[PDB]
């Protein structure tokens, strides 16, 4: 049965992306310098997320703290103490009214900044890996019990549950159209979900180990993933096949995060070797590197404006590059 | 104008962060691990989602966490505990059919990339049951190498031989590769485990400081 799908995908292999892209001009050397440094967290930082204004952002640390920063001045706006130390994720509402976090308590807490909790979304049977607002009314989460769910904050009950992964789901990302989203789990597979139908439209494979990060292409027609096999791969929704892979024989450490730039030309990845690399999304060549962290980098983020990039590490510091 | 208020708020936040740092530094975090056969809950009952237990010995505050609300697979959430002061390992030494699984888990923990610097306090629990069983299974049927063993206890050298063989089984893999293991025998009614943990943490921190201060 699956061999029919394999043959169908093979039949569409007209030419590799490398052959088509052999003519486009090179990006050239990319050198970036640190502009800011944010300090104050006691323990390792685990996650962060930019706001829509491209000025404010939030970060979570496993000492039991949430902090909101003003990137321009580096001043601390809010410092929120948590109830469970081992937070693992956090997100920022598109309108800036709300901020959410979650971790090993199997609870997703939402805070109102207009600071105290406003809603606790209990019901998951495993630790929370990621969460992302769709609006002030709805949010999407992924859990270590291999399920993703969509919540209604006002009622605080699940509306739909997405199932089909066999291992823990580690990452997810929302399409720009807000009508679709993808996730990756610890089974070397990524799936495309429809928020309204609540069913799996497509499935993708090609990695060898657990997938740790995933992100949507700016156009909404592609995405990338990073896994413990120390490689990154790009997929196309229409072709239903892998387009390009970014790997080098000198690196044997897994990836922790991935992100795109404004025009989708640069793909940025965070590695366990205490460094981040810059890839040419088309030519598939390593164009630059960011160094300066003294421990494994755990998160990444490119501002919606595209003017800057932020990174976090287990060294307990956040840095802004431009 | 508003910048003055912003800087004042930043200073107010920093004043509280500095105070919280001190209380954070004065408490040591421990992770409790083991299978359901072991009476690891009986250890914390002698001091008293994620369960927690707080006890104080010699004016030092200890905080121990028992994570038991997740699936069987643990290669992903175990990483969160990379900075604990020590790991407490509890084994039911009487049930021979589980010793191999315990050894496999111990070896997996000992060689993990993100755990290569955490010392382990090893508890061999339920000694009375072991003595009763041996004084009567034969141990050899599960570990054939036992028949060649010789000791390096109240009325039988046999029980000493068996218990020390079990202990050496762990020490052999412990000494095969910065961090150290501390074995202890313990019964189900031992009111000294807090003292043992206190002394072991003292030794661990002293050893770390000896290099932190460039004294080698």
């Amino acid at each position, epitope marked *: 049965l699956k061999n029919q799908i394999r043959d169908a995908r093979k039949a569409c292999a007209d030419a590799t992306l490398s052959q088509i892209t052999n003519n486009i001009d090179p990006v050239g050397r990319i050198q970036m310098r640190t502009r800011r440094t944010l300090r104050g967290h006691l323990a390792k930082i685990y996650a962060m997320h930019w706001g829509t204004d491209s000025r404010l952002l939030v970060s979570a640390s496993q000492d039991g703290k949430l902090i909101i920063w003003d990137s321009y001045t580096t001043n601390k706006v809010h410092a929120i103490p948590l109830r469970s130390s081992w937070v693992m994720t956090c997100a920022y509402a598109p309108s800036g009214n709300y901020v959410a976090c979650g971790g090993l308590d199997n609870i997703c807490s939402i805070y109102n900044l207009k600071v105290r909790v406003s809603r606790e979304l209990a019901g998951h049977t495993g630790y929370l890996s990621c969460c992302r607002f769709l609006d002030d009314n709805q949010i999407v989460t992924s859990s270590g019990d291999t399920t993703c769910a969509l919540w209604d904050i006002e009622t605080g009950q699940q509306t739909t549950t997405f199932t089909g992964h066999t291992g823990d789901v580690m990452s997810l990302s929302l399409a720009p159209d807000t009508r679709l989203f993808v996730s990756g789990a610890c089974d070397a597979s990524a799936k495309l979900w429809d928020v309204r139908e609540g069913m799996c439209r497509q499935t993708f494979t090609g990695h060898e180990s657990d997938i740790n990060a995933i992100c949507f292409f700016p156009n909404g027609n592609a995405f990338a993933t990073g896994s413990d096999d120390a490689t990154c791969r790009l997929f196309d929704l229409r072709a239903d096949q892998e387009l390009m892979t970014y790997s080098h024989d000198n690196i*044997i450490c897994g990836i922790t995060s991935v992100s795109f730039s404004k025009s989708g030309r640069l793909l940025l990845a965070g590695y366990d070797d205490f460094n981040c690399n810059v890839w040419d999304a088309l030519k598939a060549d390593r164009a630059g590197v960011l160094a300066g962290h003294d421990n494994r980098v755990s998160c990444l983020g490119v501002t919606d404006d595209g003017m800057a990039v932020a990174t976090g590490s287990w060294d307990s510091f956040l840095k802004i590059w431009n | 104008n508003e910048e003055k208020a912003q800087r004042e708020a930043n200073k107010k936040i920093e004043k509280q962060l500095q105070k919280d740092k001190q209380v954070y530094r004065a408490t040591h975090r421990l992770l409790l691990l083991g299978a359901d056969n072991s009476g690891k809950s009986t250890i914390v009952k002698q001091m008293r989602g994620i369960f927690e237990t707080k006890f104080q010995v010699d004016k030092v505050n200890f905080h121990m966490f028992d994570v038991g609300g997740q699936r*069987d697979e643990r290669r992903k959430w175990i990483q969160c505990f990379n900075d604990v002061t020590a790991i407490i390992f509890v084994v039911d030494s009487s049930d021979y059919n589980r010793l191999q699984e315990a050894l496999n888990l111990f070896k997996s923990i000992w060689n993990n990339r993100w755990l290569r610097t955490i010392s382990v306090i090893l508890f061999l629990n339920k000694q009375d049951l072991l003595a009763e069983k041996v004084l009567a299974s034969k141990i050899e049927d599960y570990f054939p190498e036992f028949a060649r063993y010789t000791t390096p206890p109240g009325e039988d050298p046999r029980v000493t031989r068996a218990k020390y063989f079990i202990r050496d089984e762990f020490l052999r893999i412990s000494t095969a590769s910065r961090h150290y293991c501390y074995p202890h025998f313990t019964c189900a009614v031992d009111t000294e485990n807090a003292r043992r943990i206190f002394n072991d943490c003292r030794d661990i921190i002293q050893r770390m400081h000896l290099r932190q201060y460039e004294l080698l």
Partner: nanobody, 115 residues
Framework: QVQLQESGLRLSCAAS????????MNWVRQAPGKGLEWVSDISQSGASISYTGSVKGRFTISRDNAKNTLYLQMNSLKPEDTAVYYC???????????????????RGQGTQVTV
């Protein structure tokens, strides 16, 4: 996709979808009415090998990286050996935690051996 297919005494385990030479390998058994148990494992190059005590001196593991195949040699079988045998892979490519878990993504469907 990563695939493992066992057959078969000399058991065989063919592998595909990944570089077989990078990962450590294991054998797992499940006797009727009991949970999974660890049997043996072989390092990446085969220079290190280990067995459970109950089968020491009675079984024999081997691997052939030139064709991505894994073997197990069994003799002097006892009635207690009747079980379903699984071919498992360690999670990471250069380091083995969850091979015995009830659900595991990198082990095969198993083969039946009845004495």
């Amino acid at each position: 996709q990563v695939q493992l297919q066992e057959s078969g005494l000399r058991l065989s385990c063919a592998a595909s979808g990944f570089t077989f030479s990078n990962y450590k390998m294991n054998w797992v058994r499940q006797a009727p009415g009991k949970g999974l148990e660890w049997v043996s494992d072989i390092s990446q190059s085969g220079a290190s090998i280990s067995y459970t005590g109950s089968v020491k001196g009675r079984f024999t593991i081997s691997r052939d990286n030139a064709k991505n195949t894994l073997y197990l040699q069994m003799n002097s079988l006892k009635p207690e050996d009747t079980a379903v045998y699984y071919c498992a892979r360690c999670p990471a490519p250069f380091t083995c935690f969850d091979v015995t878990s009830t659900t595991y993504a990198y082990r095969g469907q198993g083969t039946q051996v009845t004495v």
